[PDB]
Symmetry: D2
């Protein structure tokens, strides 16, 4: 065709996750929980009211199959999710914060399936790139456990699909959610065929992983790369890490597909991090990935929603990425003049030191 | 025996979107009363209330407000939520009266709306009247005190308090805050007062990402020695909890144990230099999950009764902020050089 | 064409109304206001997740023009709405409960425009019928005043459009929101070219109108018909009123178009009425209108959202109407077995008496 | 002088969607604590608290619960919100103790969770333990009373209370409710007790749409003469406000003035026949806007202090329900024939 085609995966069901649920400890009940669907729903609704949807190609998600999940997760993980989802009131699963409503496994299948649908249509050439605004998120789900709001690891399920079904030999997952993608790291730990990169706040969540000396094992040694930035890092540190480490690592690896785990909890207003990224930072991060993807594999890249918890500001951070994909700047970030003066734009010595240490790991990528 | 606690149901009755900019309306606004209400409710369900002396607030008068604010500010406020603003400032006065008189040793005034951004001329940043400056002016003008210290550990800069006492050495104003957080263009170390007040305003603008390590170091290296140097007859703490590791309106990493130690250091120096005449007045804070435990930790520092554990203690202890970083210590040491002019 | 075409008008902006805002009276502030967008948004989202959207033809609304509004409202009403919408914080307008956010007049134009778009496509034959899930509502807006959450009178603006632009000579507006359509009654009070029918709880809102002896004036005498049912009426009274009064009145009048003002606040769970209609009642009401429309004007009818305040049950009441239009029963009402035993299904003597008095007014319709 | 008021912060700390049925999750559930919390807060900001005697609740014991409930119910409840259920029943006991002893004349226990649907065997309808039946059993077994009356004007049928005292004439159980509202299959006039209890359960199932007219007529024609006939030594009122004109869980039209008159009629007959020994225990109610004014109206009936107007008085006065309709009066007159067997 002769149309610029940027895919957008959304489904009302992604906003229907049951995020509902100690007195002895005098922990008073919360009604509006941290992972409430409002935050990501406001992002979807801004895509629509900003007019960006007029430049996007809506892509209907279809459920991932059990076989799609079993490519990267244990049968026990899947059996546990089916069991909890079948309970009359649903329940928690994996850890103390991850919850399934009754029947909620359907949304988890559809979230993974949305990442697969975007992957299929990008690899086929039907779409140049796109954004999958899926819920629930994925990157903390390991081979063995759901956790951290993540039932199934959507980006890893997409990468395995691209490998097994679409013939790809090298995939890179670049995770810029502010928390460590420990699930993705675990799944591909011993596998050089998926380069796994996580940039995150050092020791944020999980508090015990994401360190720079977690580099893979066996055939996978050197094919996991963690960038654990200090609290308070903003656009300066993030853009420097993308230009000094992530882009050069991708060029060295030559992935046939780049899957971005796109969270916005590194934003300056997110409660679940101390990072200071603005919408302008996220726009640049997205643009750097699109550019290096065009350079090394003909633009085969796509973005899949992970975390983010600011209902005020996440919609504008997500829109900035969308506008980087469409080339259409239709709406201004209304916080930019206040957030820009708050700090984070300048690269600090301690931030630069971490990134430069991470840069030394690129030599072991082949 | 006598720790005062100022609360009133009306403090929880406090009552910007733009469609052309596609800013979708928010139902639950940032300063919603739930967060401070959950603090009060934890004071009761924890049993801490059994060690506190409840203190009824009474409305501050127009003359109370006009000791520090211009008529134009008060007329703007009048031209019916002003009732709660009066009662908030009135609660700070009530606690101040009862500490100075000797009825109470110390106490906490969980008031709303907050105060430290209100300057002589303008209300701003959720603040109608400057509660702590109104209580200090009352202590000076009605109760006869010559020197008051206001120590503001809300994570934002106390620009209102700085402005009110800018040219006045009879109120030492100290603000520790995240550099450039709010307001974005104030709170720098070179803002030191003017005239007779030169040297009697002290800003500690810590970098984003600072935690217990930087905060405790700042208190032991700067704030406590500044207080010893100044010899205040009363210490009023502007106690916000928005430096907490979960607060959306800052990037700092203070834990409930950090706020406890911060309160302890103030009580300890007060006990040593002015008979323990100190009190704590609520400023900001926006984490419904975590602010109640930060506030309780300060209460427990006043009552000496540890009745409840912070459920996050193991979590945040592994997240960092507890080590003093070199960039943090350099800012603090710079500020410490300013004490020689007090 | 050879496709069954049932239109569905929705726009994200309809869920963006600012429903935000006394201490002396010790009236404690409410955070989640009565007219919060959640209720009607849950109806839109159930249209999507129930699969009903697959049988619907999405119709994009376009803004009504000032001229469309000025066909039925005073210039002062429109000037007031523009003034309030322009204020930095918006403000109340008309009465003490009707609120505009900053820029909120755009949603009011788009709500009226959605009713116009459905009217155009039904009259043209592009659609057989359809449902416009617009917000804000319309039926309390008079010639002179916005009120009762209603900025502009959407169904009257649509009827006037159909008359002035599309050539129609007779239109009927049938209003089954549980409150009296006093705005619609006022606009067409002296006009026999729009038959205005309101069925509502007697004395609910406005408390001082909706009575059976309000029948129009002048050329309009006998061309306004109020059915003020007693509190506690349910399916029995409503279906009887539709079969004994509303359907015969429409047959006598022979409208070229039937516009339904479709509220669901007569439902058994709505806080703003004491009525007991179930989803099955609303399904029958819709079906009776579709049937009489097919009999007398070739199916030229359409439904436009008015009120409703139960987030639990309004989605299932609205879906029941949607399913009556599509012919596709894809989802069960999960309350039907409990609501059905609660009363309201039986026609009571006092309910029948009111309806029969209303039936005597049909003789004056020509 | 002595009107008791039972409240505890924990009563406001009380902590169904199905995706295959496309029932979208609800965040703010029907029994959210805001509604009853707003009632408590209006008691304070209205100044009514200044005329009340605060009464601290204490936990009801297992033996308190087992006077009316089976072990299987209590074991199901145990197998940590049960703490609040204990404290709710305990608050009803505390008020009962203090009324019977003479320390207080009357009072209101604003407890949560509610109680009247809990039968001997099963918790249900938001009710864990039957608070009013636990207080009546305490009054009988511990305090020696021979006759108790429980008058339940929550809009739903008190099936739990009916079940507990079904075969017992020593507790006269009266429920006025919307016919077939909840549970949908109980509350009919032919449910009159069994055995020694035959004639000592009295249901008044009013039709949907009933308002002040039917409710006041029912109280003057049935409930008050039933109480005079029975001569209770204590009157316990199960006070719900879900018959209010704005409640989503009923179709009745009672206003705040209707609840005031209802409370007044009970206090008046109590003052005449058992020394005023009556008390009021919170049951249901779901209108955050209007329930606080309905509850305050009952408080004002106990204290005799009208400090605040109902902001809806003019609105609802024009909405009807105030006239007694023929279908309503026929139900009431039918129920009145049942008094001859008390
Ligand atoms: O974006 C992501 C997200 C990864 C997962 C991050 C985990 C987020 N934690 C929560 O939501 C959370 C965890 N505990 C709690 N309470 C809690 C904490 C400790 C013990 C018991 C409860 C809590 C609950 C109610 C009130 C107050 C509190 Cl303290 N409340 C919320 N990954 O990429
Ligand atoms: C033991 C396994 N749980 C965790 O490690 C865990 C769970 N929740 C949290 N946060 C959390 C806790 C309570 C409420 C909301 C979030 C948390 C706290 C501070 C900073 C960032 C975060 Cl996410 N942090 C860690
Ligand atoms: O603790 C303290 C606090 C002092 C005060 C700090 C300022 C707090 N700002 C807000 O609450 C605030 C400011 N704008 C906004 N929106 C906003 C931003 C830019 C333009 C227009 C509106 C906003 C509103 C609705 C939805 C989304 C957004 Cl973005 N929303 C919230 N001092 O000690
Ligand atoms: N006017 C201002 O300068 C102004 C107004 N709001 C804000 N924040 C703010 C803006 C929107 C929503 C909530 C808060 C803000 C943003 C990031 C970090 C800290 C803050 Cl307080 N920041 C400055
Ligand atoms: O569907 C429709 C809807 C027609 C319009 C129906 C009007 C609906 N009234 C409200 O929303 C409303 C009206 N007053 C009030 N408070 C109120 C009542 C009287 C005086 C002052 C305020 C109120 C506010 C907060 C807390 C408690 C209360 Cl009492 N609170 C809500 N038409 O078809
Ligand atoms: C004077 C002009 N205002 C009204 O007539 C008016 C305003 N609000 C209301 N309701 C209302 C009042 C307060 C909160 C919510 C709704 C109302 C009350 C009972 C039944 C139905 C409704 Cl709608 N009822 C009437
Ligand atoms: O005051 C009293 C009260 C006594 C108890 C009366 C019963 C109260 N029912 C509920 O709260 C209730 C019951 N089901 C439901 N959903 C429901 C209905 C049918 C099937 C499954 C769920 C529901 C849940 C979420 C969203 C939408 C819906 Cl429809 N949602 C709420 N007694 O004195
Ligand atoms: N089980 C039941 O019988 C049952 C459960 N919920 C309900 N209501 C209910 C159902 C869903 C949401 C909220 C309440 C109910 C419905 C209409 C009128 C009154 C009520 Cl209480 N009604 C019965
Ligand atoms: K790997
Ligand atoms: K990451
Ligand atoms: K000074
Ligand atoms: K400060
Ligand atoms: K007419
Ligand atoms: K109507
Ligand atoms: K009995
Ligand atoms: K009852
Ligand atoms: Zn994250
Ligand atoms: Zn602050
Ligand atoms: Zn209505
Ligand atoms: Zn009830």
């Amino acid at each position: 065709g002769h149309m610029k085609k940027i895919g957008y995966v959304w489904d009302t069901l992604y906003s229907w996750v049951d995020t509902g649920t100690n007195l002895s400890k005098r922990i008073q009940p919360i009604t509006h929980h941290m992972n409430h669907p409002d935050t990501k729903r406001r992002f979807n609704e801004l895509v629509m009211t900003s007019g960006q949807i007029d430049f996007l190609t809506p892509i209907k998600p279809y459920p991932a199959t059990d076989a799609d999940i079993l490519r990267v997760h244990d049968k026990q993980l899947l059996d546990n999710a089916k069991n909890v989802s079948n309970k009359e009131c649903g329940g928690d699963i994996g850890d103390r914060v991850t919850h399934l409503g009754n029947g909620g496994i359907e949304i988890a299948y559809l979230s993974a399936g949305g990442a697969i649908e975007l992957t299929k249509k990008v690899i086929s050439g039907e779409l140049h790139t796109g954004y999958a605004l899926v819920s629930p998120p994925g990157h903390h789900a390991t081979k063995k456990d759901s956790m951290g709001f993540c039932i199934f690891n959507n980006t890893s399920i997409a990468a395995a699909y691209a490998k097994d079904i679409l013939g790809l030999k090298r995939v890179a997952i670049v995770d810029w959610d502010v928390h460590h993608g420990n699930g993705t790291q675990d799944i591909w730990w011993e596998d050089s065929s998926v380069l796994t990169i996580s940039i995150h706040q050092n020791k944020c969540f999980p508090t015990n992983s994401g360190f720079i000396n977690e580099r893979g094992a066996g055939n996978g040694f050197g094919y996991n790369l963690n960038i654990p930035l200090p609290p308070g890092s903003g656009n300066g540190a993030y853009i420097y890490a993308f230009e000094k480490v992530i882009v050069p690592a991708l060029k060295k690896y030559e992935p046939e597909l780049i899957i971005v785990g796109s969270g916005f909890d590194a934003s300056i207003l997110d409660p679940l991090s101390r990072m200071m990224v603005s919408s302008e930072g996220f726009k640049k991060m997205a643009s750097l990935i699109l550019e290096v993807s065009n350079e090394i594999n003909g633009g085969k890249c796509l973005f899949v929603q992970e975390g983010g918890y600011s209902p005020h500001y996440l919609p504008f951070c997500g829109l900035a990425v969308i506008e980087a994909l469409t080339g259409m700047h239709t709406l201004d970030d209304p916080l930019i003049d206040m957030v820009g003066e708050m700090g984070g734009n300048e690269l600090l010595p301690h931030e630069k030191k971490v990134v430069d240490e991470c840069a030394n790991l690129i030599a072991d990528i082949n």
